[PDB]
Amino acid sequence: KIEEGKLVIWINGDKGYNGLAEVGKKFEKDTGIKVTVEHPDKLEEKFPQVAATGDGPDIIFWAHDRFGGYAQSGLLAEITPDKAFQDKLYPFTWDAVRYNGKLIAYPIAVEALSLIYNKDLLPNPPKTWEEIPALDKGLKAKGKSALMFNLQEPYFTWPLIAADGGYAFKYENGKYDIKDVGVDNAGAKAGLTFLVDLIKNKHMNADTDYSIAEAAFNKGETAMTINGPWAWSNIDTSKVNYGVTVLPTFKPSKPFVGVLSAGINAASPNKELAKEFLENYLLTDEGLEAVNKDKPLGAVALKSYEEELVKDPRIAATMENAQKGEIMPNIPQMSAFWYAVRTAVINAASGRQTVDEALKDAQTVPHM
Amino acid sequence: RGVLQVSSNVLDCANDNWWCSLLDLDTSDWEPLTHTNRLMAIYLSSVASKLDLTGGPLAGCLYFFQVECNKFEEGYHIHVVGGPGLNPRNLTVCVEGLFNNVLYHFVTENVKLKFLPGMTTKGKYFRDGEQFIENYLMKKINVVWCVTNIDGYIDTCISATFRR
Numbered sequence: 001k002i003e004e005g006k007l008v009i010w011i012n013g014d015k016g017y018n019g020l021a022e023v024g025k026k027f028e029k030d031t032g033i034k035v036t037v038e039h040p041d042k043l044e045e046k047f048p049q050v051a052a053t054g055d056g057p058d059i060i061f062w063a064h065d066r067f068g069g070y071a072q073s074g075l076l077a078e079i080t081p082d083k084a085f086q087d088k089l090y091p092f093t094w095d096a097v098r099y100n101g102k103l104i105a106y107p108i109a110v111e112a113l114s115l116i117y118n119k120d121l122l123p124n125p126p127k128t129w130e131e132i133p134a135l136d137k138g139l140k141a142k143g144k145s146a147l148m149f150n151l152q153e154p155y156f157t158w159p160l161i162a163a164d165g166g167y168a169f170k171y172e173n174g175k176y177d178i179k180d181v182g183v184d185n186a187g188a189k190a191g192l193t194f195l196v197d198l199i200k201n202k203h204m205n206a207d208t209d210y211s212i213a214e215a216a217f218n219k220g221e222t223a224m225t226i227n228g229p230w231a232w233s234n235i236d237t238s239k240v241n242y243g244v245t246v247l248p249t250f251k252p253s254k255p256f257v258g259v260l261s262a263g264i265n266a267a268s269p270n271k272e273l274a275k276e277f278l279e280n281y282l283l284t285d286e287g288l289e290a291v292n293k294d295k296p297l298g299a300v301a302l303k304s305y306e307e308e309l310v311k312d313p314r315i316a317a318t319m320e321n322a323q324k325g326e327i328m329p330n331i332p333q334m335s336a337f338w339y340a341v342r343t344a345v346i347n348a349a350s351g352r353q354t355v356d357e358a359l360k361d362a363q364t365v366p367h368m
Numbered sequence: 369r370g371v372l373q374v375s376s377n378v379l380d381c382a383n384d385n386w387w388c389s390l391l392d393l394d395t396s397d398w399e400p401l402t403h404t405n406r407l408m409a410i411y412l413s414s415v416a417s418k419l420d421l422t423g424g425p426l427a428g429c430l431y432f433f434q435v436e437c438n439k440f441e442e443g444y445h446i447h448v449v450g451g452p453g454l455n456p457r458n459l460t461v462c463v464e465g466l467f468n469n470v471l472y473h474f475v476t477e478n479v480k481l482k483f484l485p486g487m488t489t490k491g492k493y494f495r496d497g498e499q500f501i502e503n504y505l506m507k508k509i510n511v512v513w514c515v516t517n518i519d520g521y522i523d524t525c526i527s528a529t530f531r532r
């Protein structure tokens with residue numbers, strides 16, 4: 001529940017919520033205001049359902065694609081960072097959170113899937129997707145499997161699907177045309193056909209999810225996975241000698257690039273406490289540091305601390321993948337996109353539909 | 369997306385071809401139906417059925433139908449949420465044709481429905497049907513009946529349990 005004089009912060013379960021809590025304790029210290037940090041399930045769908053009338057949180061963390069919907073439904077307070085602060089953060093990162101002229105969230109960091117391989121089991125990770133079947137057969141012989149990654153969330157599958165020409169909305173003249181979806185072109189159909197065939201040929205199993213593939217890779221039962229920066233803390237704990245590298249080509253894999261952002265509920269009384277916490281405790285060198293140390297954030301939007309993080313070869317691997325992918329749109333139609341390509345992906349991997357039917361569907365879904 | 373108004377008169381004109389169908393109205397996870405509520409179910413179910421094997425511009429389309437009680441007049445409105453060959457220039461005619469052609473068999477006089485397409489304040493057709501379904505129509509529980517061919521909403525649309 002929200003209360004005047006206290007901060008409630010939602011943030012997804014795979015990120016460093018504990019390290020953020022350490023930032024809230026420093027805040028509590030300096031001001032007398034208790035911060036509490038909570039990681040519910042499905043919070044990108046829970047927030048719009050309860051923000052207006054129910055118990056929303058004071059500050060909400062997610063990738064910048066969902067905020068265009070929130071700010072359209074007006075669940076979000078303005079943000080007022082002055083030019084002096086705006087300068088501390090990267091111009092492109094403030095662009096991902098700008099909607100209809102107005103900044104609608106605090107950017108935090110840049111996220112992009114990469115290829116994470118087990119150097120012991122695979123010293124030279126495949127540069128191309130098409131090499132993967134042959135590499136899975138030579139690895140099933142040894143008791144292992146080439147690749148396992150999360151096939152339920154279209155976030156992971158998309159890089160392969162946009163590689164040969166799939167896209168969401170046609171970006172033209174600074175404006176996304178919601179009349180022009182490209183999930184059913186030839187290049188998307190090819191991306192997904194390759195993914196389904198990897199499941200038919202037993203090289204991956206359609207049922208694999210985030211929990212299953214993180215366990216296969218962190219235990220050494222597969223040589224490769226696909227994941228973002230948040231995933232490296234648990235791989236470090238598992239002692240796997242891993243490496244983070246460019247994603248396989250198909251026929252480059254373009255991932256959709258997320259900017260982790262913070263927004264402020266319209267139903268908060270503590271809108272100025274939130275603004276002070278973000279600008280002065282979290283988006284500082286030490287604050288971000290405290291969060292990154294729990295679960296890495298990737299490439300933080302604060303210049304001054306991004307300059308040290310990028311010396312890490314992993315973070316340059318992630319920016320590499322980001323330069324080949326695309327920044328996610330933020331427009332409200334993005335929840336309808338993600339609905340449509342999530343349905344197609346799960347129906348084509350499980351056999352419920354053909355690749356051609358399940359993509360003819362998700363072509364209509366996002367722009368009725 | 370849009371709306372069709374259904375006056376109380378349209379229900380008065382109902383004939384026995386409309387009432388006498390055994391089609392499976394699955395109210396195990398719903399609320400029971402009143403004779404005119406059931407009339408709207410049967411209509412929605414039968415417009416859906418005819419849509420499924422209708423060609424031309426409506427071939428291959430995805431649809432979401434939802435009929436409610438008009439809160440301050442008698443009668444009902446139907447929420448309608450696209451496809452290739454379905455554009456702003458034929459949408460009204462195609463949606464009116466589909467519904468009038470099924471209803472023609474169910475009423476004892478000439479009755480025609482009108483489709484009012486949901487517009488923006490800036491005069492543009494709405495192209496958000498899916499987030500409309502997700503953020504408005506599925507949240508009603510006030511909802512008489514609902515039929516759809518969009519995967520994932522096929523089972524849930526006539527779940528009281530889910531919408532709650």
Ligand SMILES: OC[C@H]1O[C@H](O[C@H]2[C@H](O)[C@@H](O)[C@@H](O)O[C@@H]2CO)[C@H](O)[C@@H](O)[C@@H]1O
Nearest residue numbers: 012014063065066153154155156258338
């Ligand atoms: O799966 C579709 C999903 O893509 C993005 O969600 C990512 C998010 O960017 C990451 O922060 C991470 O935690 O995993 C998520 C995948 O479940 C979009 O942000 C989201 O709207 C969309 O549903």
Ligand SMILES: [Zn+2]
Nearest residue numbers: 436445446447
């Ligand atoms: Zn209504």
